[PDB]
Design a protein around this nucleic acid. Structure first.
Length: 59
DNA sequence: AGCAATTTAAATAGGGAAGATAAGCAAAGGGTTGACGAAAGCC
């Protein structure tokens, strides 16, 4: 399910971003979602504390 | 005690043999490098 997942994300810290300083330093935790660069094939990153979240039937 | 000459021509061709093989092993490791969240003493 997808809504189940979006809400699983929201019960947690719940950040979706296209740019971050988390890659520069893992202790940083700055997450930035730019709106202008979202396109058809724009890959999009997300953050959860310790990457938590349930999986689907396909894992 | 330096003086030692000039031109001219330097071979055309025919051949550079194929047949064989070119190992099989067994190794090639992991040891550290984790940030948030949550109890839990402690100024």
């Amino acid at each position: 399910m997808i809504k189940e997942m979006i809400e699983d994300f929201i019960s947690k810290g719940g950040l979706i971003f296209t740019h971050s300083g988390r890659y520069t330093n893992t202790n940083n935790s700055c997450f930035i979602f730019n709106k202008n660069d979202i396109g058809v094939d724009t890959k999009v990153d997300m953050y959860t504390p310790k990457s938590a979240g349930i999986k689907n039937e396909e894992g």
